Amino acid sequence: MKGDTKVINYLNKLLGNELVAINQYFLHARMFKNWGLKRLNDVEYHESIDEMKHADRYIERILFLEGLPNLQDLGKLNIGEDVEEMLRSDLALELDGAKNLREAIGYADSVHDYVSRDMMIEILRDEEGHIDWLETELDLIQKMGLQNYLQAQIREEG
Amino acid sequence: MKGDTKVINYLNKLLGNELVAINQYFLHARMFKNWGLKRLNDVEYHESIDEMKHADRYIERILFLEGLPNLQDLGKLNIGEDVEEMLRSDLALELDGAKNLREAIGYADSVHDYVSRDMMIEILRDEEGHIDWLETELDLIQKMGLQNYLQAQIREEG
Amino acid sequence: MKGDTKVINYLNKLLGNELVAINQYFLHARMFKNWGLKRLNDVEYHESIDEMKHADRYIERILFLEGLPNLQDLGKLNIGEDVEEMLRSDLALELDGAKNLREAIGYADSVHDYVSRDMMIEILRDEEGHIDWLETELDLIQKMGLQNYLQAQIREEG
């Protein structure tokens, strides 16, 4: 079914964001794992899988709407060198992605692509859950101190 | 444990190949799915998951050897427009990757990084399995004709 | 128990036929497998196992009758280069073997080696089953055409 060209461009742009998050969250995960921060590896890896699911949804949607998914262009990764920097970087990435999502959702509505909108709203809901987790972790680092925070990561939950 | 710098560069180069295959196989898969070629979507998607597993192994190994995994640089995808072109493109990608693997395996041996070698040999074994499948499919297209070939893809196995 | 010398020679000759069929059917099987003709690999391989069972029966019988099983001499294999040629070659091999079996069965009867005869009749029954399958497949190639025939081989049954 021929979709609206601009919806397709938004979908490719969102896909682009997901491709960046997939890689950044995957590397961050295995960095945590290497450091023995098991709990962080589990969450971060499952966050990477989640973005893969999102990418898959965009790819299928783009294809259905008869556009060309773009997996060739990869935006800037921002890989941190310590736990806090890594988490802040993920947070900034999510915030930028939410921004793009809000714009796309608004536009899809005004061209009546309600199923693209509906798919994007579920994704935004998942992203806000991830933003919440990131914000909470960053606050915990500050409230309990880094040493205690790190110790709390060495065993998986539960 | 500080690894050999050049082994790390090889590992990053191989990781690079996997990142390309992950994306190319994933797009190809969902293209097949869109076309209703269920059997091809299943194999191609599972081939994409397989390259993700390979990437994961390289990432962990690089990290253990104390290098920096590079997930920022993404080589050229070659996305085909019909089934045969897609499969040929995957085949050429695998052949180039096997070439790189053989070189890395040789070099790891001569610096005594036997566990990197051992990991790379398992990966090469998986790739040759994939090359075999690709070669066989391409020959089937020719032997049974495209119409029959396509019909044979519309139901998953078994 | 000292058997009739000539029965032993027949048994060794039949064993000879089985040794040829074992190898020819095994190679043919893995050729089909390589080509992705799964259904043909299954039947052909199980036909190879069957001839191994026959060889085993001859070997034990020869030994019981106090002769020397000959596994040293291997007759001519006729390995085909395409599906039809392979199947025709197996068919001609079975037909020649049935011929030898009929002679041996007749002779065993006239020297009263009724248990050798009885064993050979079961084997002839298995061979005629195999001849029937071969004849039927060859006719299918012709009736449905090679392209359809090949497509019908790519998935195992059932």
Added chain:
Amino acid sequence: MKGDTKVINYLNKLLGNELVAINQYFLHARMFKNWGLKRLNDVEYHESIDEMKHADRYIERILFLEGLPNLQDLGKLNIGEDVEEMLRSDLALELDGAKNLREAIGYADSVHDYVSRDMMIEILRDEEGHIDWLETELDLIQKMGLQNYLQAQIREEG
């Protein structure tokens, strides 16, 4: 995938060794069985099946590498007339095969056929297990005497 021609020749040569062992171990097995040496029939027969598995691996590998498996040429069998001679003959056969394997493994490495090498190393590992068993049995014959050795073979284990 077009393999190295010389690797293919080695593979055919090793296949040749397996074809000889398959037959020799099978006859030896049923000789032991005829003599009521149940334990020896079980081991020897399972050693024959093992060489069949090896042959199968060579055949598939040769085919994948696009060469012609040779099952037509059968080397010299050396069938013994008593238990010790049979076992010594198997031992000499294994030792010659290990020799050929070592050469092939070395050569495959230098042309970078690492998966052929890897397959051949698993096979060599199985052969050395068989050599160990043979050497041990032959020593037992000598240590306990032939009469005791034979008595120890009449019931299967365990």
Added chain:
Amino acid sequence: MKGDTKVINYLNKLLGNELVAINQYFLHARMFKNWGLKRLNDVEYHESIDEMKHADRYIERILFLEGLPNLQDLGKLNIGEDVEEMLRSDLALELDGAKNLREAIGYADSVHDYVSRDMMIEILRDEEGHIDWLETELDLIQKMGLQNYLQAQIREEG
């Protein structure tokens, strides 16, 4: 159904052989048991049951063919006084019985009593199995020595 008179006479003669074997094998069995040769008692007793089954088949067949089964005349038993003599005596008895069976099978064929023939061939097959076991045991006595042979009989298998 009125059978051929001469087939009936053969059947009565074979029945005669079975009656002798039943008794001889039964006595031999309980002699072995008395001597504590458990393994030999088990085989010999089950050989006695087997000949009873054969007798039963002849009796039913004779009756069906409307003749008179003769259980009144009992041929010569040859009871041995030591293990080897007992086994040799059983062997000679089986060999004489096989001789009679071969003649009867030939004759039944020429008068078209194919079901009598078919029954006699199954019996001959059982007898040749028994001959094989006897021949093997006698050879074991010689190969391992009597003392070892006897020791190997004192526990049942398995």
Added chain:
Amino acid sequence: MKGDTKVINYLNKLLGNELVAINQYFLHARMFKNWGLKRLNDVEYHESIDEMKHADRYIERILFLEGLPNLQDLGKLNIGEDVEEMLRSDLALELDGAKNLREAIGYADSVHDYVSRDMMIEILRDEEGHIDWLETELDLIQKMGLQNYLQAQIREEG
């Protein structure tokens, strides 16, 4: 099977390393246990069992190759007096052992003892896993502080 003399010497040298690790890891384990550091006792003890498995492999291999395993000479233990010193000492021991392994693996290859090589590569893979764990623990001590690190050891996982 007579092995290469120098391979045997390497195997005895590696065995020597294992004997030292077995004892050092065992004492370190029960020191941790005494201190109530349950988690460390579990890992360290299981690391001791692991080196026992390695020793067993060398012993069997040496014996098969017809050499004399040397369990008489015991190298220097380096037993630490606090957690960090103990772990650093294990780490230095593993690093020295990896060094010896790499040399032996290289040499086994050049004399074609591919199964000794293959066994040694599996062992090196286990050692690198242990090195990774040690490096990670030592970094955790530093990142979370000793007090937090110790507290994290008092309950077993999970």
Added chain:
Amino acid sequence: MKGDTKVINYLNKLLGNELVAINQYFLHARMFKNWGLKRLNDVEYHESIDEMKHADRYIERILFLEGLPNLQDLGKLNIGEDVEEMLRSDLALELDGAKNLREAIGYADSVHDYVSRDMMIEILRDEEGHIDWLETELDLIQKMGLQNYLQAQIREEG
């Protein structure tokens, strides 16, 4: 809890005996295994595990009593070259160890270290069981002869 210094020295001396037995029994076990003497490998290996358990008890006890377990000094192994010599050597080792145990048990009593005594009495009980087994085996060698003795070892029990 600060233990008596001399009890600690005894405990270290007994530990020393266990370290020797661990190694000697382990090598002897795998020698038996190499020779195909399965039954002897099982008992001897389980005897080695048993001495490891004893060593573990001494190590924990020494640590609890606040001494330094000594795993650095390894007494003389006496590795035999044939079955009888190996068993005699183990027997002499056990006898010397029982001697040391009796002295230590007496002394622990007179300084009121009743729990060290109680632990040592359980160990002495295990050693006397092992002495009994050794004495019995050595007598069997003599009573049945070496050839019969060896044959009785080739299958595990039961």
